[PDB]
């Protein structure tokens, strides 16, 4: 049994809700929240922008030190950093950004990072300002992630379309 409430169970391991990821993280304090990161961990907008704002920029400060030591992530890659006031840990995952021309086949590689964590609160990778089709992102998620994932959908309209169209 876990703390997650109000989620629509899609498969054995994937759940979905219309929820504010910051507000959901603040309520649950999950072991892992996933950030929709870029390779530079520059948390300017979308999921990263919102999560980082909710940490009062502490996520960005920590991320800048990570990059100064390690250099950029790979598209499809990830790193584990603090969850600050939102979670124990933040898994920063880089999905391909279609608005930069990145290979959408890297979306599966991005989701494979979730399998290193037994339970996660996450957004749909490469959705929103990363430019991918969120229906496609949900399909790759269900077909890739084997651990228990609780997906927070930012839009009520999009949430209803994802559920209604789910095979």
Ligand X SMILES: Cc1ncc(C(=O)O)s1
Cβ pair 25, 160 in contact under 8 A: no
CA atoms within 13 A on the CB side of 120: 28
Q: Residue count at the site for ligand X (CB under 6 A)?
A: 8
Closer residue to ligand X (CB): 57 or 70: 57
Closer residue to ligand X (CB): 65 or 160: 160
User: How many Å separate Cα 30 from the centre of its chain?
Assistant: 13
Shortest gap between Cβ of 33 and ligand X (angstroms)? 12
Closer residue to ligand X (CB): 45 or 72: 45
Task: Name the residue number minimizing CB distance to ligand X.
Answer: 128
* Sole residue written with tokens 């907008």: 45
For the chain, first and last CA: distance in Å?
A: 26
User: How many Å separate Cα 124 from the centre of its chain?
Assistant: 6
> Does the footprint of ligand X cover residue 16 (CB under 6 A)?
no
Contact residue for ligand X among 39, 122, 123, 159 (CB under 6 A): 123
Contact residue for ligand X among 16, 50, 54, 142 (CB under 6 A): 50
Largest CA distance in the chain: 45
> Does the footprint of ligand X cover residue 154 (CB under 6 A)?
yes
Shortest gap between Cβ of 158 and ligand X (angstroms)? 8
> Does the footprint of ligand X cover residue 114 (CB under 6 A)?
no
* Sole residue written with tokens 């749909």: 124
Cβ pair 136, 144 in contact under 8 A: no
Binding positions for ligand X, rule: CB under 6 A = 21, 46-47, 50, 123, 127-128, 154
């Amino acid at each position: 049994v876990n703390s997650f409430s109000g989620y629509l169970k899609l498969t054995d391991n994937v759940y979905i809700k219309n929820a504010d990821i910051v507000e959901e993280a603040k309520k649950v304090k999950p072991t892992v929240v996933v950030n929709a990161a870029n390779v530079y961990l520059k948390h300017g907008g979308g999921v990263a922008g919102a999560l980082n704002k909710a940490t009062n920029n502490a996520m960005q400060v920590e991320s800048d030190d990570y990059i100064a030591t390690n250099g950029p992530l790979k598209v499809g890659g990830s790193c584990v950093l603090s969850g600050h006031n939102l979670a124990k840990h933040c898994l920063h995952v880089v999905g391909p950004n279609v608005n930069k021309g990145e290979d959408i086949q890297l979306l599966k590689s991005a989701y494979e990072n979730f399998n290193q964590h037994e339970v996660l609160l996450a957004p749909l990778l490469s959705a929103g300002i990363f430019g991918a089709d969120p229906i496609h992102s949900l399909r790759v998620c269900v077909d890739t992630v084997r651990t228990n994932v609780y997906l927070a959908v930012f839009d009520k309209n999009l949430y209803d379309k994802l559920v209604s169209s789910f095979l």
